[PDB]
Symmetry: C4
Subunit: 388 residues, 4 copies
Amino acid sequence: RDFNNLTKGLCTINSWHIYGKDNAVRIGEDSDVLVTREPYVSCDPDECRFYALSQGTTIRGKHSNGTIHDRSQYRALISWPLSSPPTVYNSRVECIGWSSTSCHDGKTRMSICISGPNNNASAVIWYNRRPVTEINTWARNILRTQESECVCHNGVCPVVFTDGSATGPAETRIYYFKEGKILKWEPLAGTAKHIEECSCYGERAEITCTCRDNWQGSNRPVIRIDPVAMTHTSQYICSPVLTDNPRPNDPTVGKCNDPYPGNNNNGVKGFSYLDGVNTWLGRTISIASRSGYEMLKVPNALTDDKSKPTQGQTIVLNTDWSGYSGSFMDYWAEGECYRACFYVELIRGRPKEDKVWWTSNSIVSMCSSTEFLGQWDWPDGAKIEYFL
Amino acid sequence: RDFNNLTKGLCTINSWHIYGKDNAVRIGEDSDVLVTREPYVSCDPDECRFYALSQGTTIRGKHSNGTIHDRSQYRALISWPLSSPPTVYNSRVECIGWSSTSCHDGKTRMSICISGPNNNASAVIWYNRRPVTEINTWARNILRTQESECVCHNGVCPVVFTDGSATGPAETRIYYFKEGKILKWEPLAGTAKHIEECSCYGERAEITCTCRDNWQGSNRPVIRIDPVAMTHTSQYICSPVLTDNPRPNDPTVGKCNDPYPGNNNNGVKGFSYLDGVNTWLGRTISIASRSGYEMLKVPNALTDDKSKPTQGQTIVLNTDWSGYSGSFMDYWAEGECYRACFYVELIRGRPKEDKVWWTSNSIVSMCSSTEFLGQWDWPDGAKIEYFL
Amino acid sequence: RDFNNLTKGLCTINSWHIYGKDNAVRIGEDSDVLVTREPYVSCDPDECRFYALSQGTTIRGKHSNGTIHDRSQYRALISWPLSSPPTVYNSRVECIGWSSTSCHDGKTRMSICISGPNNNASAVIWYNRRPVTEINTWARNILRTQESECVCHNGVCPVVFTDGSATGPAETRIYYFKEGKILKWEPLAGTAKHIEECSCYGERAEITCTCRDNWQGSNRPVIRIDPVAMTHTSQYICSPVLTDNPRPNDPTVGKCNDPYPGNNNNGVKGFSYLDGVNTWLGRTISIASRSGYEMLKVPNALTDDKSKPTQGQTIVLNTDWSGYSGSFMDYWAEGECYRACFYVELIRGRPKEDKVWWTSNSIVSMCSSTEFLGQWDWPDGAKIEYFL
Amino acid sequence: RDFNNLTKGLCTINSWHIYGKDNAVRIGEDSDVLVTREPYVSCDPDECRFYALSQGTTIRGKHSNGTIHDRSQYRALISWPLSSPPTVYNSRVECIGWSSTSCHDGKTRMSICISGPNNNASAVIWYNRRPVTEINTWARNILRTQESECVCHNGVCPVVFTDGSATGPAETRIYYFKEGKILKWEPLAGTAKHIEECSCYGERAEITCTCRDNWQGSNRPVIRIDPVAMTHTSQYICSPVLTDNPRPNDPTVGKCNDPYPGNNNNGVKGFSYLDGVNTWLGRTISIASRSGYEMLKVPNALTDDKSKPTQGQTIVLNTDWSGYSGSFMDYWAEGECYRACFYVELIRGRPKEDKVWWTSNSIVSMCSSTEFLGQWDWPDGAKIEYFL
Ligand SMILES: *[C@@H]1O[C@H](CO)[C@@H](O[C@@H]2O[C@H](CO)[C@@H](O[C@@H]3O[C@H](CO[C@H]4O[C@H](CO[C@H]5O[C@H](CO)[C@@H](O)[C@H](O)[C@@H]5O)[C@@H](O)[C@H](O[C@H]5O[C@H](CO)[C@@H](O)[C@H](O)[C@@H]5O)[C@@H]4O)[C@@H](O)[C@H](O[C@H]4O[C@H](CO)[C@@H](O)[C@H](O)[C@@H]4O[C@H]4O[C@H](CO)[C@@H](O)[C@H](O)[C@@H]4O[C@H]4O[C@H](CO)[C@@H](O)[C@H](O)[C@@H]4O)[C@@H]3O)[C@H](O)[C@H]2NC(C)=O)[C@H](O)[C@H]1NC(C)=O
Ligand SMILES: *[C@@H]1O[C@H](CO)[C@@H](O[C@@H]2O[C@H](CO)[C@@H](O[C@@H]3O[C@H](CO[C@H]4O[C@H](CO[C@H]5O[C@H](CO)[C@@H](O)[C@H](O)[C@@H]5O)[C@@H](O)[C@H](O[C@H]5O[C@H](CO)[C@@H](O)[C@H](O)[C@@H]5O)[C@@H]4O)[C@@H](O)[C@H](O[C@H]4O[C@H](CO)[C@@H](O)[C@H](O)[C@@H]4O[C@H]4O[C@H](CO)[C@@H](O)[C@H](O)[C@@H]4O[C@H]4O[C@H](CO)[C@@H](O)[C@H](O)[C@@H]4O)[C@@H]3O)[C@H](O)[C@H]2NC(C)=O)[C@H](O)[C@H]1NC(C)=O
Ligand SMILES: *[C@@H]1O[C@H](CO)[C@@H](O[C@@H]2O[C@H](CO)[C@@H](O[C@@H]3O[C@H](CO[C@H]4O[C@H](CO[C@H]5O[C@H](CO)[C@@H](O)[C@H](O)[C@@H]5O)[C@@H](O)[C@H](O[C@H]5O[C@H](CO)[C@@H](O)[C@H](O)[C@@H]5O)[C@@H]4O)[C@@H](O)[C@H](O[C@H]4O[C@H](CO)[C@@H](O)[C@H](O)[C@@H]4O[C@H]4O[C@H](CO)[C@@H](O)[C@H](O)[C@@H]4O[C@H]4O[C@H](CO)[C@@H](O)[C@H](O)[C@@H]4O)[C@@H]3O)[C@H](O)[C@H]2NC(C)=O)[C@H](O)[C@H]1NC(C)=O
Ligand SMILES: *[C@@H]1O[C@H](CO)[C@@H](O[C@@H]2O[C@H](CO)[C@@H](O[C@@H]3O[C@H](CO[C@H]4O[C@H](CO[C@H]5O[C@H](CO)[C@@H](O)[C@H](O)[C@@H]5O)[C@@H](O)[C@H](O[C@H]5O[C@H](CO)[C@@H](O)[C@H](O)[C@@H]5O)[C@@H]4O)[C@@H](O)[C@H](O[C@H]4O[C@H](CO)[C@@H](O)[C@H](O)[C@@H]4O[C@H]4O[C@H](CO)[C@@H](O)[C@H](O)[C@@H]4O[C@H]4O[C@H](CO)[C@@H](O)[C@H](O)[C@@H]4O)[C@@H]3O)[C@H](O)[C@H]2NC(C)=O)[C@H](O)[C@H]1NC(C)=O
Ligand SMILES: CC(=O)N[C@H]1[C@H]([C@H](O)[C@H](O)CO)O[C@@](O)(C(=O)O)C[C@@H]1O
Ligand SMILES: CC(=O)N[C@H]1[C@H]([C@H](O)[C@H](O)CO)O[C@@](O)(C(=O)O)C[C@@H]1O
Ligand SMILES: CC(=O)N[C@H]1[C@H]([C@H](O)[C@H](O)CO)O[C@@](O)(C(=O)O)C[C@@H]1O
Ligand SMILES: [Ca+2]
Ligand SMILES: [Ca+2]
Ligand SMILES: [Ca+2]
Ligand SMILES: [Ca+2]
């Protein structure tokens, strides 16, 4: 009943414990599970849920054929109970579209879905489950947004959008919403050169977003937002531990204010927690594809262009498929600090597994522990052969 | 806890944004989805839902064979969560029958279902989910009602019924309900010559209904209701932009007080928003069948017999099937105006697609934006070949 | 939050309107619907639900084979939302067993299930969804109860049980429960000679039960209960309109205090409303089997041994299968009188349809109207051929 | 809203009445039922539910192949409504892992799941459905816990864990949790020599746990916990009525302070109620495998090394498969005493039924009656042949 404020710092991250896993593809082999992609996790004050973009068909369904495609009239943002699979019968539609974000401000939830043809897309901003504001495409080239949760502070929920080229300069805007209405927007500033799919978290009245430079950068761009002043900066992770994909091999020195070169015109949504010595980066293990997943403790990664790992944890073996990853936290938990969490999208089917005609995913997520916990690996677990 | 009053005017309609879409036929190819038709949308103060007449069988079920037929003992009014499909497991039965309307008065919901043989039908009026009032057929020829939501003002919810011929003069009545009890009824007056399937909305203490003249009219009849005085008038949309189906080609001058001729004994449920220069009409694109769907801004359409479009938006391409369309609004939303909404029934199967033995539909709906949003088209999306 | 009292009389019954219908067998041909039998309907202060004895298997399931049998370890009393089918996913288990009753006292619900072998059965009485009291078999021969709702008055809910022979004198007891605890019990008194499966309703502080005399009677026995004094009487319906099944042809004079002879050792659960001139009897249309169903207005049927029909309504044609029927009312509805309701079990499969290996049913129910409504017939609607 | 205290003694157990049964394997032959094992039952103040470790696949699913294995990344603790089957659509995930316990303290629920490889497992302790505390493996050999409900007293919920060998001395710890945080832990003391899978209940401010000595004991070890002092003792059931499995034949004298020999390196989770003359033991009927199940009244079993049965009740015939059994009670029921309950896991499939490639189970549970009720037997009820 009052707006949430980011009054706490991050808990110390000494390892990662298992939080949730839906085993959707394993289960959906023989039950009514929706084909998805672009998932995430987001908490309300009373409940945490799984989120994703449905493809408007079950996995066993004949309409799963062609679901490699990102943008259709049959997609929607759905949410469902934590660690359940997204089924026809338990999935709640938040809004219609093929690009989304969502966050609760402490009183109620804002959800945003973009739909339309590539040259004529529009965002609709829902708040308390009703449509409130609409935004038309400004650059007429796939208006698109975070594909993970936004973050609010005292009613103000910033959202990062991009419109324009995926392979050249584009038009990125930071919208500051309150109760679904636009308080303000700004064009992207700072030294980030291309921005897509920001993964965001909040601590001590600052919102940090780790994004995807699709055009040039194999290091990740970072936007930091003041939700009170409604201003931001941008730079890159300085660290030579490179965290996009595909990417070249790790160098010994990164770049703070420019894209690290070697791979153009591609990437993956990812995330980091940037908190001095309490800094952890996620990446795919493979430099070539969305294969494997690990967390690496890289003290001062944001600001230190020679920073290297001092600790890590494998999440998904490099013999298993991964995908998008992103940040969320339970802002309404007990205690004196915010516990960092993330999810990894485990993509199955096309293009890497082309014996099936579909593309889908399941979800695994972890949150930080102050203990030094033993590690397991967490694969999707499905046998593609069963779907043949 | 107090009755809702229609105290607001319509928001300015500059375009239409996507509101909901269930993709029911695509999803029901491989999950337990009920065969429906005659759908709509209706809001409670805390939730908006999809409504339809079930056929008492799933689409993949063997009993889907024969579901082209409108009236059986196996039909029921169901509701289900917004943009979900109507499944066996998530569908809530409101009442039993093969013709319906439903609306919330601010305290609770009235639902009405008609059932029976053609010569002996009866309406039962439910209120707070209990049966309260029953009305026997007065003309012994398919007693029937709106197939979309009614509208309430201070407890009074008017409903339009027709009994008698579909191809000649019939007996239309306006019932004024309060808490499921009949306050008053009136025979149809004014210049409308035949009335079926009224699509209604409320603003500034007046209820406007756009209906179907099955007997003669390719222009649409309009009933306007004073829910305080409990009186009404009727006329036709004056505009030469004709909005029934099938229909002849658009002339340059309409008819205000008589059916526009050229097509007899057929039609489709449709709707309009009639608000001076803020006037928008829906129609099928095809003049021959329930094919395509568009919205047209036709300033003063109700009163101007030469009024032509000044703006439009395509909803469904003329290469895709449509069906019934109707009006609803979220009377419990925030802000200073009521945002116009509509749904379009996307009919699949018989009679236009006769390689399957069933008839069903899915739903798409939009609400107005004050922005000038880019347009997409929104087809059902299912492949009939998959059902073979 | 206070116990309900039977303070109202019955509304005048001038006809019957459709209340609910689940079409379970039609729908369960292609969805996960539980095999049932012995259904009924019962209201809470906020909701009315369908009830039945599950067979612990879906209809399409391989374990549906053998479900003609009444008593197994796999049966349970389930409830589910009104007019929904009893599915695996929406059915709530009230208790485990193969004979049951259930009723809400205004504060919470009592449910009773009997289980065990024929010579060693026991009742467990649940209240507020916890087990409170248990009763062991007294005659060691299929302890059994109403198979429809009980009725409460000021916390006191009487229940009729029988233990002993189905084809000879047996031991019937009336238990008076309050908060799941036994206040009192009595052996059956009066002139009823055999009692099974009582169908009960309450009005003006009296509970009337119409039961089944399996041993000799083709007229129905009647128990009337004073829930304050905790006493009862019994007799038969005097009327020559005979309402058990199988039965001989209607005579011109009935029997008030003895079974009407002609058929031994068989019957069906049925019901009546006995209210002077406002008296209505249900029966199968067939005198030979559970085929068809009609309601007949038989003024003074209880006390007049020459009383004949003055009005009727067909519910199920004699070309369609019926089954058990029983009484319930919504004691928590608005208004000045209790509206009589009933359900009819529509049995499909064995023994009358032996091309399938299962026995199941669906449900239709009606409540009274003060109007003289037109009639329809309400068959199960499924095609057995589809299940082959 | 206040913590529950164990203020009541056990009700007198004169027999056992049926409480719940899900018939999961019968139903899951033709519906979307999760493969499980290691089930139990646990009550909240407003609801009692079924619990189990999912295998992350339906029974009919192709991924059911290999589900004999205990520990995978696809397992999770789920709960679901009492006597329902654990379906994809009604199962709520409590936490991720392959060993668990759960209990409500009167304000909210603590749930604990262990996951990881054998040499590197970790417990995560959830409270109010959020992760609060994590515990790393201390002996690097399958950290594991009760597989049935824990018990709380004034906020303090003790839990028994074991880490180390299954076939030799191991490291057992008693953790005392409050609001998901560790108040204290102790190493196992007393004369119990090996501890696994404790089944616990609470009465008069003492918690009694009956466990599994996998290494040597065919009598069962017993831990008794003071949740105020946060101390414990351990011994064995003195009785010569031996209750593990496999086991040698019953002798005439047991052992109070040492394992009863004859079978090494195997066992089954089981339980007892130890209350002077009101003492009842469960066991499999078979001495060789998890076949059959009975309850035996063995006055002073805990302390009397010659105690023999004075009464019993068969639960599952020795011609039917059983499995794990464990204790729970409804601490929030009415009345002056706690009513003892238990469940039995009915295992189907591998290894005893190897014509199928899966292992799963269903559940039956009973609670005590003060009556001397007639007995039935309660088999799983499924036909394996149907799954072929
Ligand atoms: C039970 O569970 C536990 C808990 O999980 C398990 O214990 C864990 O074990 C894992 C696996 O070993 C550990 O993860 C690795 O962590 C290291 C970081 O720790 C080493 O380095 C630390 C930093 O050392 C510099 O500074 C220090 C001072 O600050 C200085 O002292 C030192 O000399 C040095 O100059 C050391 O502090 C650390 O020592 C503490 O911990 C030790 C245990 O780990 C202990 O033995 C010590 O005594 C001490 O007390 C230790 O030496 C990460 O570096 C590593 O991440 C690299 O390697 C993996 C493959 O294993 C790779 O996937 C990673 O990406 C990463 O390497 C790439 O990136 C580098 C950076 O650019 C690059 O240099 C590398 O060449 C490499 O590059 C190639 O691969 C990448 C990726 O594909 C590609 O992009 C490139 O282009 C290129 O192709 C792992 O994260 C956990 O930290 C550890 N956890 C704990 C709590 O201990 C335990 O094993 C389990 N038990 C069992 C029985 O299974
Ligand atoms: C990005 O998204 C945006 C947003 O959606 C897209 O932009 C939209 O584009 C669509 C498609 O073009 C537009 O819909 C059409 O709108 C016109 C109405 O606008 C024209 O006419 C206006 C009125 O002009 C008279 O009065 C004015 C003064 O008031 C006077 O100035 C004028 O000279 C004239 O005498 C003009 O004001 C308007 O101009 C503004 O907008 C222009 C952009 O549209 C801009 O360029 C201008 O400079 C200006 O600023 C404009 O000229 C509708 O008329 C039209 O509806 C007709 O045609 C479609 C087929 O396209 C048909 O399906 C419709 O039913 C309708 O036509 C039938 O009915 C008529 C009425 O009886 C009849 O006369 C016709 O012959 C026709 O009849 C046949 O078909 C029917 C139906 O099957 C049948 O029943 C008959 O029997 C017969 O067989 C469209 O609705 C949107 O308005 C526009 N939206 C916005 C915000 O701009 C943009 O394209 C997308 N971008 C990309 C790159 O894709
Ligand atoms: C639109 O919908 C409406 C609303 O539903 C439809 O209108 C309804 O139509 C149905 C079907 O006709 C009616 O049901 C029958 O009702 C009669 C009772 O009403 C007749 O008798 C009344 C009593 O008359 C004695 O007393 C009066 C004075 O009190 C005296 O005046 C009279 O001369 C006589 O001596 C009359 O009052 C009544 O007249 C009012 O209504 C008339 C319309 O119905 C109207 O025309 C009149 O002018 C007047 O105003 C009328 O004459 C029931 O008797 C009958 O039930 C018998 O027959 C059916 C087969 O049809 C059978 O299944 C029943 O079981 C029952 O008969 C068996 O039992 C008898 C009792 O033992 C026995 O005598 C019979 O031989 C028979 O026995 C065989 O069958 C049974 C069962 O299988 C077996 O067990 C035996 O062994 C043996 O084999 C029907 O219920 C509705 O009442 C009527 N409703 C309304 C509101 O009007 C309308 O039709 C629909 N419109 C269209 C176009 O479809
Ligand atoms: C209707 O429903 C009701 C309610 O359920 C049914 O009635 C019930 O019927 C069942 C089945 O008969 C009963 O269960 C058995 O109970 C006996 C215990 O009761 C006998 O013993 C009592 C104790 O007697 C010593 O002390 C007393 C004084 O305290 C002294 O007087 C006496 O002489 C003696 O020295 C007697 O008090 C008791 O008498 C009361 O009740 C009688 C009715 O039962 C009545 O007739 C009497 O007049 C009196 O009023 C009675 O004589 C258990 O011992 C027995 O459990 C053994 O046998 C089963 C097989 O049946 C086996 O599975 C069990 O494990 C157990 O036996 C193994 O363990 C023993 C202990 O180590 C060992 O000694 C045995 O050799 C045996 O060992 C082999 O098997 C095991 C297991 O596989 C293996 O591990 C070993 O290695 C080895 O291979 C049953 O539980 C219910 O108690 C009774 N309930 C009630 C309320 O009456 C009624 O039948 C149903 N009606 C119908 C028509 O179906
Ligand atoms: C009660 C009833 O039968 N309504 C049906 C109406 C009437 O036939 C017409 O309005 C003529 O009166 O229209 C439909 O057939 C149609 O056109 O798709 C569907 C609808 O179910
Ligand atoms: C407890 C029990 O078995 N009840 C069964 C009763 C009894 O057999 C009779 O009332 C004779 O006592 O009737 C049925 O068989 C029936 O006629 O369809 C169904 C019901 O399940
Ligand atoms: C954590 C774990 O693996 N628990 C497993 C235990 C252990 O193997 C034993 O208690 C030996 O320690 O027992 C089972 O195998 C069994 O006997 O059915 C099932 C259970 O899943
Ligand atoms: Ca990149
Ligand atoms: Ca027409
Ligand atoms: Ca009889
Ligand atoms: Ca053992």
